Short mmCIF file of C-alpha atoms in Angstrom, two decimals:
data_model
loop_
_atom_site.label_atom_id
_atom_site.label_comp_id
_atom_site.label_asym_id
_atom_site.label_seq_id
_atom_site.Cartn_x
_atom_site.Cartn_y
_atom_site.Cartn_z
CA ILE A 1 0.13 -0.03 -0.14
CA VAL A 2 1.51 3.16 -1.49
CA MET A 3 0.88 6.79 -1.36
CA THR A 4 1.65 8.93 -4.90
CA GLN A 5 2.51 12.43 -4.80
CA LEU A 6 8.37 16.63 -6.99
CA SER A 7 8.72 20.53 -7.54
CA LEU A 8 5.91 22.89 -7.58
CA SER A 9 6.83 26.50 -9.24
CA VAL A 10 4.28 29.10 -8.00
CA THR A 11 3.96 32.55 -8.58
CA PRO A 12 3.50 34.72 -5.40
CA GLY A 13 -0.36 35.32 -4.57
CA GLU A 14 -1.41 32.37 -7.02
CA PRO A 15 -3.27 29.30 -5.87
CA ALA A 16 -1.48 25.82 -5.54
CA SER A 17 -2.59 22.44 -5.78
CA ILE A 18 -0.48 19.29 -4.64
CA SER A 19 -2.29 15.90 -5.80
CA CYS A 20 -1.95 12.94 -3.49
CA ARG A 21 -3.17 9.15 -4.81
CA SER A 22 -3.79 5.96 -2.56
CA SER A 23 -3.41 2.52 -4.00
CA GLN A 24 -6.21 1.48 -1.68
CA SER A 25 -9.58 3.58 -0.92
CA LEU A 26 -8.65 5.42 2.70
CA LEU A 27 -12.54 4.86 4.00
CA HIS A 28 -13.15 3.35 6.83
CA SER A 29 -16.06 1.30 8.00
CA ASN A 30 -16.32 3.95 10.69
CA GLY A 31 -16.99 6.22 7.98
CA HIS A 32 -14.11 8.41 8.33
CA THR A 33 -11.35 9.00 5.64
CA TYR A 34 -7.84 9.11 7.45
CA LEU A 35 -5.96 11.14 4.94
CA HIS A 36 -3.92 14.30 6.48
CA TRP A 37 -1.22 16.87 4.97
CA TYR A 38 1.75 18.34 6.46
CA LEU A 39 3.98 21.06 5.43
CA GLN A 40 7.50 20.78 6.36
CA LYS A 41 9.73 24.49 6.20
CA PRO A 42 13.38 23.81 5.68
CA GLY A 43 14.91 23.33 9.00
CA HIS A 44 12.22 22.29 11.06
CA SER A 45 9.85 19.68 11.78
CA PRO A 46 6.70 18.89 10.04
CA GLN A 47 3.43 20.97 11.01
CA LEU A 48 -0.22 19.40 10.48
CA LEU A 49 -2.31 21.45 8.13
CA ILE A 50 -5.27 19.37 7.37
CA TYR A 51 -6.72 16.25 9.47
CA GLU A 52 -9.09 13.56 7.68
CA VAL A 53 -9.24 15.14 4.29
CA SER A 54 -10.63 18.75 4.72
CA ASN A 55 -10.31 20.00 8.70
CA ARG A 56 -7.92 22.38 9.61
CA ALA A 57 -5.34 21.49 12.35
CA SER A 58 -5.69 24.20 15.43
CA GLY A 59 -4.38 27.55 14.20
CA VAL A 60 -3.73 26.54 10.81
CA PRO A 61 -4.96 29.15 8.33
CA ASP A 62 -7.69 29.72 5.90
CA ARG A 63 -5.80 29.70 2.94
CA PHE A 64 -4.99 25.75 3.42
CA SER A 65 -8.17 23.52 2.20
CA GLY A 66 -8.30 19.96 1.56
CA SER A 67 -10.44 17.70 -0.79
CA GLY A 68 -11.00 14.31 -2.08
CA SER A 69 -12.36 10.83 -2.20
CA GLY A 70 -11.05 6.97 -1.43
CA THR A 71 -8.01 7.04 -3.76
CA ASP A 72 -7.59 10.72 -5.05
CA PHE A 73 -7.30 13.75 -2.86
CA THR A 74 -5.86 17.45 -3.13
CA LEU A 75 -4.14 19.99 -0.85
CA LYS A 76 -4.98 23.59 -2.39
CA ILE A 77 -3.33 26.81 -0.85
CA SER A 78 -5.49 30.25 -2.30
CA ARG A 79 -2.51 32.22 -2.26
CA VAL A 80 0.92 31.24 -2.07
CA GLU A 81 3.51 33.36 -0.43
CA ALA A 82 7.48 33.08 1.13
CA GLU A 83 6.01 31.21 4.58
CA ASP A 84 4.35 28.43 2.10
CA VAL A 85 7.88 27.50 1.00
CA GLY A 86 8.55 23.98 1.86
CA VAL A 87 7.83 20.34 1.45
CA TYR A 88 4.03 19.25 1.80
CA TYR A 89 3.48 15.29 2.51
CA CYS A 90 0.41 13.31 2.29
CA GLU A 91 -0.19 10.51 5.16
CA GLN A 92 -3.00 7.83 5.90
CA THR A 93 -3.85 6.38 9.54
CA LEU A 94 -6.81 4.55 8.00
CA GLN A 95 -4.74 0.97 8.79
CA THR A 96 -0.90 -0.13 10.16
CA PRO A 97 1.62 0.40 8.55
CA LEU A 98 0.96 4.07 8.66
CA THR A 99 2.25 5.73 5.58
CA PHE A 100 3.75 8.76 4.16
CA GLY A 101 3.62 10.39 0.20
CA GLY A 102 6.98 11.21 -0.99
CA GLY A 103 6.32 14.89 -0.90
CA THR A 104 5.92 18.07 -2.72
CA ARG A 105 8.26 20.66 -2.76
CA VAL A 106 6.67 24.16 -3.28
CA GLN A 107 9.03 26.77 -4.98
CA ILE A 108 8.43 30.44 -5.57
CA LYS A 109 8.59 31.20 -9.36
CA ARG A 110 10.43 34.28 -10.54
CA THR A 111 12.40 35.93 -13.45
CA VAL A 112 15.78 34.53 -14.03
CA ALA A 113 18.89 36.24 -12.16
CA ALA A 114 22.14 35.40 -12.92
CA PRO A 115 24.82 34.29 -10.37
CA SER A 116 27.96 36.37 -9.06
CA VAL A 117 30.81 34.15 -9.13
CA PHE A 118 33.85 34.13 -6.95
CA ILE A 119 36.43 32.01 -6.71
CA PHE A 120 38.75 31.11 -3.79
CA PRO A 121 42.43 29.66 -3.44
CA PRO A 122 43.53 27.62 -0.67
CA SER A 123 44.53 29.38 2.67
CA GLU A 124 48.23 29.12 3.90
CA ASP A 125 46.81 27.56 6.66
CA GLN A 126 45.47 24.71 5.01
CA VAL A 127 48.42 23.77 2.70
CA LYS A 128 50.63 23.57 5.78
CA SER A 129 48.82 20.00 6.85
CA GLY A 130 48.90 18.56 3.25
CA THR A 131 45.66 19.57 1.21
CA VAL A 132 43.96 22.10 -0.41
CA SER A 133 40.55 23.28 -0.91
CA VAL A 134 39.61 25.57 -4.10
CA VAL A 135 35.91 27.08 -3.64
CA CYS A 136 34.11 28.84 -6.48
CA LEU A 137 31.00 30.63 -4.91
CA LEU A 138 27.57 31.11 -6.87
CA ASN A 139 25.63 33.55 -5.24
CA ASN A 140 21.79 34.60 -5.80
CA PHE A 141 20.76 33.14 -9.25
CA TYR A 142 17.75 31.16 -10.23
CA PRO A 143 16.72 29.02 -11.85
CA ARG A 144 18.21 26.22 -10.14
CA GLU A 145 20.21 24.18 -12.78
CA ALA A 146 23.63 25.57 -12.95
CA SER A 147 26.73 23.81 -14.10
CA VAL A 148 30.09 24.59 -12.74
CA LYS A 149 33.11 23.19 -14.69
CA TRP A 150 36.95 23.27 -12.84
CA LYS A 151 39.63 23.47 -15.25
CA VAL A 152 43.52 23.26 -13.98
CA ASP A 153 45.46 24.79 -16.31
CA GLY A 154 43.25 24.62 -18.87
CA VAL A 155 42.11 21.10 -18.36
CA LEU A 156 38.89 19.57 -16.96
CA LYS A 157 38.41 18.10 -14.15
CA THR A 158 36.49 15.28 -12.76
CA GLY A 159 35.38 13.16 -9.95
CA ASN A 160 37.09 15.78 -7.96
CA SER A 161 34.93 18.06 -6.61
CA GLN A 162 31.84 18.34 -4.61
CA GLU A 163 28.85 20.84 -4.63
CA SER A 164 25.94 21.56 -2.66
CA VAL A 165 23.14 24.01 -3.16
CA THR A 166 21.12 26.36 -0.43
CA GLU A 167 17.34 26.41 0.08
CA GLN A 168 15.02 29.21 -2.01
CA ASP A 169 15.95 32.29 -0.13
CA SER A 170 13.09 33.82 1.59
CA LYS A 171 12.89 37.30 -0.10
CA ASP A 172 14.75 37.22 -3.40
CA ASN A 173 13.86 33.35 -4.27
CA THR A 174 17.23 32.83 -5.19
CA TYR A 175 19.28 29.87 -4.91
CA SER A 176 23.41 29.69 -4.14
CA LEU A 177 25.88 27.12 -4.71
CA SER A 178 29.35 26.13 -3.43
CA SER A 179 31.56 24.01 -5.23
CA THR A 180 34.98 22.56 -3.94
CA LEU A 181 38.16 21.34 -5.66
CA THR A 182 39.78 19.07 -3.24
CA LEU A 183 43.44 18.49 -4.31
CA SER A 184 46.36 17.04 -2.12
CA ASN A 185 49.09 19.51 -1.74
CA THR A 186 51.75 17.92 -4.20
CA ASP A 187 49.32 18.23 -7.12
CA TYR A 188 48.32 21.65 -6.19
CA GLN A 189 51.73 22.57 -6.76
CA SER A 190 52.01 21.12 -9.99
CA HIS A 191 49.74 23.78 -11.81
CA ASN A 192 49.53 27.16 -12.15
CA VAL A 193 45.98 28.54 -13.32
CA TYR A 194 42.74 27.47 -11.35
CA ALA A 195 39.49 28.27 -12.80
CA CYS A 196 35.82 27.38 -12.20
CA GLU A 197 33.60 28.32 -15.47
CA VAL A 198 29.76 28.85 -14.84
CA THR A 199 26.70 28.24 -17.12
CA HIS A 200 23.58 29.51 -16.34
CA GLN A 201 20.67 30.70 -18.44
CA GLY A 202 20.99 33.99 -16.90
CA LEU A 203 24.06 34.64 -18.99
CA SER A 204 24.60 35.35 -21.95
CA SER A 205 27.90 33.26 -22.21
CA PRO A 206 29.96 30.73 -19.52
CA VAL A 207 31.55 33.40 -17.17
CA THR A 208 35.11 31.82 -15.76
CA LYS A 209 36.80 33.36 -12.55
CA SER A 210 40.15 32.40 -12.26
CA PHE A 211 43.69 33.02 -9.94
CA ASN A 212 47.17 32.01 -10.61
CA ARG A 213 48.97 30.13 -7.84
CA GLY A 214 50.95 32.21 -6.08
CA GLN B 1 5.28 16.80 25.38
CA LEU B 2 7.87 15.07 23.69
CA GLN B 3 11.48 15.11 23.64
CA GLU B 4 13.81 12.60 21.70
CA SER B 5 17.42 11.25 23.35
CA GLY B 6 20.15 9.06 21.42
CA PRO B 7 23.21 8.65 21.48
CA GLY B 8 24.71 10.92 18.40
CA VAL B 9 26.66 8.54 16.63
CA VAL B 10 26.07 4.14 16.58
CA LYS B 11 28.83 2.16 14.72
CA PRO B 12 27.76 0.50 11.90
CA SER B 13 26.16 -3.32 12.59
CA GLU B 14 25.39 -2.02 15.90
CA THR B 15 22.16 -1.42 17.64
CA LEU B 16 20.68 2.24 17.70
CA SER B 17 18.76 3.11 21.09
CA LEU B 18 16.28 6.10 21.58
CA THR B 19 13.68 7.49 24.06
CA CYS B 20 11.20 9.67 23.70
CA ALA B 21 10.11 11.31 27.34
CA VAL B 22 6.55 12.43 27.45
CA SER B 23 5.47 15.08 29.60
CA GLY B 24 2.13 16.88 29.94
CA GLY B 25 0.38 13.50 30.40
CA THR B 26 0.73 9.65 30.94
CA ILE B 27 2.03 7.68 28.05
CA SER B 28 -0.71 5.19 28.69
CA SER B 29 -3.62 7.38 27.62
CA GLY B 30 -6.14 6.01 24.86
CA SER B 31 -6.36 9.38 23.81
CA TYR B 32 -3.28 9.15 21.29
CA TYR B 33 -1.47 7.05 19.33
CA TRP B 34 2.52 7.59 19.69
CA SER B 35 4.93 6.78 16.59
CA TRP B 36 8.95 7.06 15.91
CA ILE B 37 9.06 8.72 12.21
CA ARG B 38 12.62 9.45 10.72
CA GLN B 39 13.78 11.45 7.78
CA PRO B 40 17.29 10.93 6.49
CA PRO B 41 18.98 14.14 5.79
CA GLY B 42 17.33 15.79 2.30
CA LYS B 43 15.03 12.78 2.02
CA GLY B 44 11.22 12.16 2.53
CA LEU B 45 9.34 10.83 5.71
CA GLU B 46 9.28 7.48 6.91
CA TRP B 47 7.15 5.95 9.42
CA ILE B 48 9.01 3.47 12.00
CA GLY B 49 6.48 2.23 14.26
CA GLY B 50 3.86 2.87 16.63
CA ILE B 51 2.19 1.72 19.86
CA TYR B 52 -1.57 2.13 21.59
CA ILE B 53 -1.39 2.04 25.13
CA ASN B 54 0.89 -0.51 25.92
CA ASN B 55 3.11 -3.30 24.53
CA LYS B 56 0.39 -5.65 23.43
CA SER B 57 -0.57 -3.05 20.31
CA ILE B 58 2.80 -2.29 18.87
CA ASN B 59 3.25 -2.05 14.82
CA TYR B 60 5.85 -1.69 12.99
CA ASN B 61 6.69 -0.87 8.90
CA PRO B 62 7.29 -3.56 7.17
CA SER B 63 10.85 -2.53 6.04
CA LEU B 64 11.54 -2.83 9.42
CA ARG B 65 9.89 -5.36 10.77
CA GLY B 66 12.19 -7.96 12.28
CA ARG B 67 14.89 -5.54 12.69
CA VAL B 68 13.27 -2.73 14.90
CA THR B 69 12.03 -3.30 18.47
CA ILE B 70 9.42 -0.57 20.34
CA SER B 71 8.59 -0.39 24.08
CA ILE B 72 7.17 1.69 26.80
CA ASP B 73 8.15 2.27 30.12
CA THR B 74 5.12 3.77 32.42
CA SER B 75 7.45 4.19 35.13
CA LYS B 76 9.42 7.24 33.38
CA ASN B 77 6.34 8.01 31.07
CA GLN B 78 9.09 6.84 27.98
CA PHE B 79 8.69 4.67 25.17
CA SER B 80 11.65 3.69 23.19
CA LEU B 81 13.34 2.63 20.21
CA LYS B 82 15.59 -0.16 19.30
CA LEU B 83 17.33 -0.67 15.65
CA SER B 84 19.63 -3.23 15.50
CA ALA B 85 22.13 -4.36 12.77
CA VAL B 86 22.56 -0.13 11.47
CA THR B 87 23.94 0.79 8.25
CA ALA B 88 24.47 4.54 6.50
CA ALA B 89 21.01 4.33 5.60
CA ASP B 90 19.79 4.66 9.21
CA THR B 91 21.46 7.95 9.11
CA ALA B 92 18.96 10.07 9.85
CA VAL B 93 16.73 12.44 11.94
CA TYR B 94 14.40 10.21 14.39
CA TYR B 95 11.23 11.89 15.46
CA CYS B 96 8.31 11.01 18.02
CA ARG B 97 4.61 12.11 17.52
CA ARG B 98 1.82 12.27 19.43
CA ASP B 99 -1.56 11.68 17.56
CA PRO B 100 -5.13 11.93 18.88
CA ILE B 101 -6.99 8.72 17.73
CA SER B 102 -10.30 11.26 17.15
CA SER B 103 -10.68 15.23 16.51
CA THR B 104 -13.49 14.82 19.68
CA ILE B 105 -10.20 14.64 21.97
CA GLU B 106 -8.63 17.56 20.26
CA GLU B 107 -7.58 19.26 16.54
CA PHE B 108 -3.64 19.16 16.73
CA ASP B 109 -0.95 16.60 17.03
CA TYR B 110 2.75 17.13 18.48
CA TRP B 111 6.13 16.37 16.85
CA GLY B 112 9.33 15.78 18.90
CA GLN B 113 11.86 18.47 17.61
CA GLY B 114 13.71 15.07 16.15
CA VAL B 115 17.54 13.88 16.96
CA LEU B 116 20.07 13.02 14.63
CA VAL B 117 21.67 9.80 14.54
CA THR B 118 24.24 9.06 12.44
CA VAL B 119 25.61 5.61 11.25
CA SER B 120 29.42 5.86 10.61
CA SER B 121 32.96 4.32 12.19
CA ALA B 122 34.49 7.85 12.19
CA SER B 123 35.73 9.63 14.99
CA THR B 124 33.67 12.82 16.93
CA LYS B 125 35.91 15.58 15.71
CA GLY B 126 35.64 19.28 15.47
CA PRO B 127 36.46 21.37 12.13
CA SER B 128 39.49 22.76 11.17
CA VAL B 129 38.38 26.74 10.31
CA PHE B 130 40.10 28.36 6.82
CA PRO B 131 39.23 32.03 5.66
CA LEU B 132 37.86 32.16 2.32
CA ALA B 133 39.62 35.44 1.42
CA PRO B 134 37.92 37.96 -0.62
CA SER B 135 40.78 39.32 -2.61
CA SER B 136 29.99 46.45 -6.70
CA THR B 137 30.21 43.40 -4.34
CA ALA B 138 32.81 41.18 -2.61
CA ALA B 139 32.49 37.98 -0.86
CA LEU B 140 34.21 36.36 1.77
CA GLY B 141 33.41 33.39 3.97
CA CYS B 142 34.95 30.71 6.24
CA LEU B 143 35.45 27.06 5.24
CA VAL B 144 34.36 24.41 8.13
CA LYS B 145 36.38 21.17 7.03
CA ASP B 146 36.72 17.69 8.21
CA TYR B 147 34.33 17.61 11.26
CA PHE B 148 32.25 14.72 12.50
CA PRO B 149 29.26 14.20 12.85
CA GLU B 150 26.74 16.72 12.14
CA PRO B 151 26.25 19.68 12.35
CA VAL B 152 27.64 22.82 12.84
CA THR B 153 26.31 26.07 13.12
CA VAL B 154 27.97 29.26 11.97
CA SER B 155 27.13 32.62 12.76
CA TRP B 156 28.87 36.06 11.66
CA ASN B 157 29.68 38.63 13.98
CA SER B 158 27.93 36.69 17.35
CA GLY B 159 24.75 37.02 14.99
CA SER B 160 24.94 40.72 14.51
CA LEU B 161 25.60 39.89 10.81
CA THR B 162 22.87 37.50 9.11
CA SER B 163 21.84 39.68 5.90
CA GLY B 164 23.59 38.29 2.72
CA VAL B 165 24.77 35.21 4.83
CA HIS B 166 24.84 31.51 2.86
CA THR B 167 25.72 28.60 4.78
CA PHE B 168 25.52 25.84 2.50
CA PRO B 169 24.74 22.63 3.24
CA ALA B 170 27.86 20.01 4.37
CA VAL B 171 28.67 17.36 1.86
CA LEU B 172 30.33 14.31 3.34
CA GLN B 173 33.82 13.30 2.13
CA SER B 174 35.19 9.76 1.08
CA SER B 175 37.26 10.17 4.63
CA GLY B 176 33.74 10.07 6.39
CA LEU B 177 34.44 13.62 7.40
CA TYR B 178 31.93 16.41 7.04
CA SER B 179 32.96 19.84 5.00
CA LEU B 180 30.84 22.99 4.54
CA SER B 181 31.36 26.56 3.64
CA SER B 182 29.67 29.91 5.15
CA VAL B 183 30.00 33.06 2.90
CA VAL B 184 28.61 36.53 2.82
CA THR B 185 28.76 39.23 0.12
CA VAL B 186 28.92 42.83 1.12
CA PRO B 187 29.88 46.04 -0.92
CA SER B 188 33.35 46.24 -1.80
CA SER B 189 33.62 49.85 -0.10
CA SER B 190 32.68 47.52 3.24
CA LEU B 191 35.97 45.64 3.12
CA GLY B 192 37.99 46.82 5.95
CA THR B 193 35.30 49.18 7.48
CA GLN B 194 34.61 46.42 10.30
CA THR B 195 35.89 42.90 11.56
CA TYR B 196 34.15 39.80 9.83
CA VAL B 197 34.31 37.03 12.21
CA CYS B 198 32.70 33.68 11.70
CA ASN B 199 31.85 31.79 15.27
CA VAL B 200 31.70 28.22 14.34
CA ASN B 201 29.96 25.68 16.98
CA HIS B 202 30.36 22.03 16.61
CA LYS B 203 28.04 20.77 19.50
CA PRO B 204 28.77 17.07 19.18
CA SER B 205 32.84 18.16 20.09
CA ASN B 206 31.30 20.91 22.26
CA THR B 207 33.60 23.16 20.25
CA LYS B 208 33.39 26.70 19.32
CA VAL B 209 35.92 28.43 16.76
CA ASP B 210 35.98 32.29 15.66
CA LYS B 211 38.06 32.94 12.60
CA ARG B 212 38.36 36.68 11.86
CA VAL B 213 38.44 36.82 8.00
CA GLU B 214 40.46 39.51 5.84
CA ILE B 215 42.32 40.20 2.90
CA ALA C 1 -1.87 13.27 12.27
CA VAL C 2 -5.66 14.21 14.02
CA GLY C 3 -7.65 11.02 13.65
CA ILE C 4 -6.09 7.33 13.56
CA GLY C 5 -8.17 4.44 11.87
CA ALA C 6 -5.70 1.74 12.75
CA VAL C 7 -7.04 1.52 16.43
CA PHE C 8 -10.88 1.15 15.20
#
């Protein structure tokens, strides 16, 4: 038994509908239908919004509403704002095992914004201990799709970097990305130019930030 | 209401033990269904198991049945979770939750704040903090490298600098240690007008590190 | 959740 619910890009002030489908009917012989909706904001525990298909929990604002039947259910946000951004989960409590849907992420849709790009050489503190970390920062961009390519003396690098992206910013609805290129001290001192090349649809051409070692 | 307690780090193939302290009422109440739920970092919610009143009405997720046990201790007003043969897939935030069995009782549930459990052979270790030196807008930051386990918190100027700060999700390196960066973008004319200090807190090692960042 | 059909 499984519940079927991914990202939703929503213009602020406009309505949002999140769908949940169940493999089995969630109607109990007692007449109740045990489907509920949660919102999990980033860095928080989940908060109950709607219980038993259509009832708001205590203190839940009226812009949230629920509807559905048997195997098909829909959560509605009347006017989406920044405080509604997060992951929305449906859950059934008809029977054990209790089960959650996979989640639906709501993100605020905005106009394209190109990243500001910065490269950081390894510090002299770190090189003393035998490792070099080169960091490339992509700041406040939209949409989330971005490509970072490291080049060492013009040569493409693979398998030697890791990156992560922030959650959508609350005020400008942008993303930011940090990528770290890791090499040994010996391999770092063997090359000269270190560059991070950034491709993003907010730019007309790939942007490259680089430095010369020393 | 509810507060989870855990060991922090568990070695792979060993047993994870958690407890949830219940307050404001007895765990034996027939008004509530008590659950353990977990969430691996960046993933969805998973129900582990739950209990109604006592140990004769415990049920488990089929994916965990035979590897988990849940128990109640009415003397301490606690319920507990025991998960054996743990792998990296069991690294997660673990929540306890209280559900009213009927809206006739009340119209809200309660979730604990959750406790992170990390499954790894790595040793608990505070981070090394390196400056990301700047050299319109300028960027500076701190590289928080080779710590274990999660989490670290990073503030800037003791919390007086919050606008324009980005603290990124940590990455898990092949060494089994974590690394993250925290950055702030400032007007280029702000360079030198005040000090920029990152305050790195690693509660698992009970360590606090401050690093002034400059050109 | 509010409402647990599993106990009924």
